[PDB]
Amino acid sequence: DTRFHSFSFYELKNVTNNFDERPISVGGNKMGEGGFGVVYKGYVNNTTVAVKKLATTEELKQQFDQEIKVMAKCQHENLVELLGFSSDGLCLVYVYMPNGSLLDRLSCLDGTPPLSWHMRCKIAQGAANGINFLHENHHIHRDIKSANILLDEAFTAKISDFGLARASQTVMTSRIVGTTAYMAPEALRGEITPKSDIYSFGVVLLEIITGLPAVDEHREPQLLLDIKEEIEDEEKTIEDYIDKKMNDADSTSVEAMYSVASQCLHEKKNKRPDIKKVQQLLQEMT
Numbered sequence: 001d002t003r004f005h006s007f008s009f010y011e012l013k014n015v016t017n018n019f020d021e022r023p024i025s026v027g028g029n030k031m032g033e034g035g036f037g038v039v040y041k042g043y044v045n046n047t048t049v050a051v052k053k054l055a056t057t058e059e060l061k062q063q064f065d066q067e068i069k070v071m072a073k074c075q076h077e078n079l080v081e082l083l084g085f086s087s088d089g090l091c092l093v094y095v096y097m098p099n100g101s102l103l104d105r106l107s108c109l110d111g112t113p114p115l116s117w118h119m120r121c122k123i124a125q126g127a128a129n130g131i132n133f134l135h136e137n138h139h140i141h142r143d144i145k146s147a148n149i150l151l152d153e154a155f156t157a158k159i160s161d162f163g164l165a166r167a168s169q170t171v172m173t174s175r176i177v178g179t180t181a182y183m184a185p186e187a188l189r190g191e192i193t194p195k196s197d198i199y200s201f202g203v204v205l206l207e208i209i210t211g212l213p214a215v216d217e218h219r220e221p222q223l224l225l226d227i228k229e230e231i232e233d234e235e236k237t238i239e240d241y242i243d244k245k246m247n248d249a250d251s252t253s254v255e256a257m258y259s260v261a262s263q264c265l266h267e268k269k270n271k272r273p274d275i276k277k278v279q280q281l282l283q284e285m286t
């Protein structure tokens, strides 16, 4: 509990009730899918944990070994903690995040009340501190989205899912990974740059302001990033997009965060601010 422990598959199989695919609310252990695995709630040393059971065969093992690597090298207060792993029976064990993810909380999943603007402000500051740490350590996340911004007991932002993280000039790849709805144009075209993480963070900001998912096949607009075009071509204001589930959302602060989101969502990757400027602008906001 000061070190990365190697877990027996039978210890994990046991504390997750044989990896009980049923959700928590019905009495099961499943917390949700993501990061090329299923996340189960476990119980080790009278202490709660989150167990990711991973599910090509060599591509997955690569993402397991990447996660252990990144998680040992990158330890910050705005990053999730790795407790241990298992390869004996592939499971990654993490410190449990009682408030799940920013995505679940923005959706008010399983009776949770909406997040206030004040907590939404601190979450965005925290997530930006987390990306800044990775970026300061020549790491590119590649899959920044609200589903993997996790929330602790004080609703502190804790960035997760490092399986696709790249450790480094803009380079190109043959294997394009990430979530379309959050991805910058160049990242969709095969480029690997921390600039693409900035763009992805910009989408996260609009999700925070509006409470809306990044993509909706029937909604107009379908892609949340397109609301920037509706605001620019004066058919709407950010005011019109503010999440109705808020009490405390002030217009001066909402417009300050949207100014940050707008800069992050620049289609020209070089015109975007770096994460240090995103941090300074978000701190100025409060």
Ligand SMILES: NCC1CCN(c2cc3ncccc3cc2NC(=O)c2cnn3cccnc23)CC1
Pocket (backbone or CB within 6 Å): 031, 032, 033, 034, 035, 039, 049, 050, 052, 080, 081, 094, 095, 096, 097, 098, 099, 100, 101, 147, 148, 150, 160, 161
């Ligand atoms: N996009 C994948 C999802 C997978 C499910 N996750 C969790 C949901 C929760 N629901 C209720 C209460 C506590 C919860 C904790 C979670 N997870 C964790 O505690 C957790 C800790 N590190 N970690 C890393 C990856 C995924 N989950 C976690 C949210 C993210």
